[PDB]
């Protein structure tokens, strides 16, 4: 870090202050320097460091030491149109008593999680830890709220009949409240224990979300494929493409292809997350048959 590099120079400065053609090895405490090189000064016959002609500057040659020496706008415009869609969608869903099923209840929490994470990143884009360790909670929560929403449509298939309303509290705590199990553990470690296992404590639980939901995506598309085959075969094989593609935004399946890309300070990560939100509102709550029906009647009724 810059902070570490400043600390290492400060230690070297305090050492010099204690102590207080010449070749000195390029200093080890400067990370970015070429350490097989030397810096050069000239010492006078008079015992003074050689100056720069017509200057108060001391002559030195560090050329050997220095041998080794848009994106922001894309994520904001994207997350903000995502914000727009999801906000209208959640509000229209709310003031409609006809579609208040446990099916559409999870989507209302999914919609609220998309903008609330987007806003937490958008607000980010002790005093600054409210945009360091608060968005990290609101990222992990949205990633778990994708898992839970996918786990909901796997609960209605793999568990046969299933009782959706008999187990609805547990989904909220498994989603909104579960990232508190590791974000709060990590933030305790980073705020008390130490103010590479730096980002592994948060990421690995998030990596468990996407890989499980991706496994779960195969078990839904596989079931939907077999069921459509045991109902025209060619025409229903085209229906598989539409039905599977319309499910891709919901499960966040695009997040699996970059699961084990290690980097810091570099993508379709931005180009896709920009729209995961926009998409889940234009598919599940805008182009839905029931929602289009409900607004039409509601328009004509008043």
């Amino acid at each position: 870090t810059k902070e570490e590099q400043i600390f290492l120079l400060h230690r070297a400065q305090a050492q010099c202050e204690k102590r207080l053609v010449v070749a000195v090895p390029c200093p080890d405490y400067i990370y970015d320097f070429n350490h097989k090189g030397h810096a050069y000064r000239r010492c006078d016959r008079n015992g003074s460091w050689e100056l720069v002609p017509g200057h108060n500057r001391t002559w030195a040659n560090y050329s050997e030491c220095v041998k080794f020496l848009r994106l922001g706008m894309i994520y904001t415009v994207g997350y903000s149109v995502s914000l727009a869609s999801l906000t209208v969608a959640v509000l229209i869903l709310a003031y409609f008593r006809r579609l208040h099923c446990t099916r559409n209840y999870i989507h209302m929490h999914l919609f609220l999680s998309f903008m609330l994470r987007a806003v937490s990143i958008f607000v980010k884009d002790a005093g600054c830890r409210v945009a360091v360790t608060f968005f990290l909670y609101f990222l992990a929560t949205n990633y778990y709220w994708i898992l839970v929403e996918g786990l909901y449509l796997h609960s209605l298939i793999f568990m046969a009949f299933f009782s959706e309303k008999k187990y609805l509290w547990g989904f909220t705590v498994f989603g909104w409240g579960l990232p508190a199990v590791f974000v709060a553990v990590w933030v305790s470690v980073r705020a008390t224990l130490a103010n590479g296992n730096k980002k592994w404590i948060i990421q690995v639980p998030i990596l468990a979300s996407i890989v499980l939901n991706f496994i779960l995506f195969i078990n839904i598309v596989r079931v939907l494929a077999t069921k459509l085959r045991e109902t025209d075969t060619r025409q229903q094989y085209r229906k598989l493409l539409k039905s599977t593609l319309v499910l891709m935004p919901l499960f966040g399946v695009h997040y699996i292809v970059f699961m084990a890309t290690p980097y810091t300070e570099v993508h379709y990560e931005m180009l896709f997350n920009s729209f995961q939100g926009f998409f889940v509102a234009i598919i599940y709550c805008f182009c839905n048959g029931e929602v289009q029906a409900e607004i039409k009647k509601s328009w004509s009724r008043w």
Binding site: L136, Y143, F258, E269
Partner: peptide, 5 residues
């Protein structure tokens, strides 16, 4: 990894 982290 996650883009944000």
């Amino acid at each position: 990894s996650v883009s944000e982290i």
